[PDB]
Every structure is written in structure tokens, then in C-alpha cells.
Amino acid sequence: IPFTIKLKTCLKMCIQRLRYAQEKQQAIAKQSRRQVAQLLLTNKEQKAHYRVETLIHDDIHIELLEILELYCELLLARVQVINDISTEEQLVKEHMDDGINEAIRSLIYAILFVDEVKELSQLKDLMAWKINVEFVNGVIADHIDVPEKIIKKCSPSVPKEELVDLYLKEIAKTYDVPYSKLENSL
Numbered sequence: 001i002p003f004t005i006k007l008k009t010c011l012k013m014c015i016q017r018l019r020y021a022q023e024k025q026q027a028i029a030k031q032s033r034r035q036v037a038q039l040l041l042t043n044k045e046q047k048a049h050y051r052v053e054t055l056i057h058d059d060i061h062i063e064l065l066e067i068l069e070l071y072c073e074l075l076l077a078r079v080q081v082i083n084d085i086s087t088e089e090q091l092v093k094e095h096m097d098d099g100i101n102e103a104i105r106s107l108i109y110a111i112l113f114v115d116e117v118k119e120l121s122q123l124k125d126l127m128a129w130k131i132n133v134e135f136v137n138g139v140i141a142d143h144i145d146v147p148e149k150i151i152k153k154c155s156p157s158v159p160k161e162e163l164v165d166l167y168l169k170e171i172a173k174t175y176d177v178p179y180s181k182l183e184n185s186l
Contacts, residue, residue, distance in 0.1 A: 003130060004083045010122045011076040014107075017117040018069040022062055029058050036168070037175035045185045052167045056159045064153035068110055068120075071103035088135045092145065102147060108139045109146045113154040 032055045039048035075082065078098055085091055085100075095101050104127060111120045128136045138144040143151055165186050172182040 003126065004079055007082065007123075007126055008076065008079050010119060010126065011072050011079070013119045014117060014123070015069060015072045015076065017119055018065050018072065021114075021116050022065045022069070025058065025062050025065070029055060029062065032058065033171050033174065036171050037177050040168070040172065040177050040181045040185055043181070043184065048168065048185050049164060052164050052171075053159055056163060056167060057156060060153050060156045064110070064150070065114070067150065067153070068107060068114065071106050074099055074103045075107075082130075085130065088131055088138075091131065091135070101145060105139050105145050106147060106150045108136055109143055109150060110154060112140070 032051060036048050036051045036055065039045075039051060078100055081095070081098065082100060082104075085095065091101050091104070104123070107120055108124045108127065111124055114120060124136050124140075139146060168182060168185050171177070
């Protein structure tokens with residue numbers, strides 16, 4: 001019932017869900033790499049390219065999940081301090097050092113981009129009550145104080161052909177794809 005207890009419960013669940021999502025998505029990414037190799041072996045260059053573009057985004061998303069997990073752990077260890085935060089001014093001026101400002105803003109901003117972890121929405125609800133609605137809207141609508149790294153991993157730019165080629169070459173090494181098959185995809 002108490003705010004501190006509801007927050008602790010929320011953060012713990014977010015950590016478990018984020019860890020599980022990482023595990024699952026990493027395993028799937030591995031399968032995707034095998035499938036790209038199979039596309040290369042069968043001369044399906046166009047499809048292999050499309051699959052790599054998706055894989056690139058999948059890997060970036062996994063990195064996002066890893067960072068969010070760390071932010072959750074940070075907040076979990078400082079839960080008692082967050083209990084003494086009632087305004088955004090306090091958050092930005094008194095909690096920029098302990099990394100709380102950055103951590104909470106990043107998790108709220110991530111809700112829209114990580115629907116696989118529903119509990120993140122609970123953090124928004126909790127902070128909208130603890131601080132105010134203005135704070136949460138500033139994060140979502142205007143990404144105020146949200147780290148550039150988080151904004152980029154939530155919305156990565158188009159993969160350049162150089163990176164796609166690099167992925168193809170690394171997948172070819174992993175799966176011993178014949179030279180001719182990989183070259184035809186570059």
C-alpha cells in the first residue's frame with residue numbers, strides 16, 4: 001500500500017521481466033543469425049539483407065533492455081531516497097548525482113518502446129503521483145533530461161550499408177559461409 005512498497009514491488013518485477021526479455025531476445029537473435037546464413041547459402045541476397053536490417057535493430061533493442069535493467073537496479077537500491085522526492089526541482093537539483101533523475105526519466109520514456117514489459121507503465125503512474133503529471137509529460141512528450149543514448153536506442157537511425165555488410169561478414173565467419181555466397185550479398 002505505501003508508496004515505497006509499491007515502488008519496490010514494481011522495480012523488482014521490472015528487473016525480472018527485463019532480464020527475461022533479454023534472455024529470450026538474445027536467443028532469438030542467435031536464431032536469426034543462423035537463418036541469415038541459410039539465406040546466403042541459398043542465394044537469397046535480398047532477403048538476407050532485409051533480415052540483417054531487422055537483426056541490427058534487434059541487437060540495439062537488447063542493448064536498451066540491458067541499460068534499463070541497470071537503471072531499475074539503481075532505483076531499487078535507492079528506493080528510500082526517492083520516497084523523499086515530491087517535486088521535479090528536487091529530482092533535477094538534488095538527485096542528478098545519485099543518477100536517479102536519469103534513471104527514472106529513462107524508464108518512463110522507454111514505456112512506449114518496450115511494450116514487452118508492461119510493468120514499466122506502473123513507474124509512470126507512481127511518479128505522476130509522487131511528483132506530478134507535468135514531470136511525466138515532460139519526459140514522454142519532450143524527452144526532458146532523457147539521455148541521448150536512450151533516445152537513440154529507442155529510435156535508432158537507418159542502418160548504413162557499411163554496418164549491414166559488417167553483419168553479413170561476421171555471420172559468415174560464425175557459420176563458415178562459403179566465400180562466394182557471402183560476396184554475392186555484399
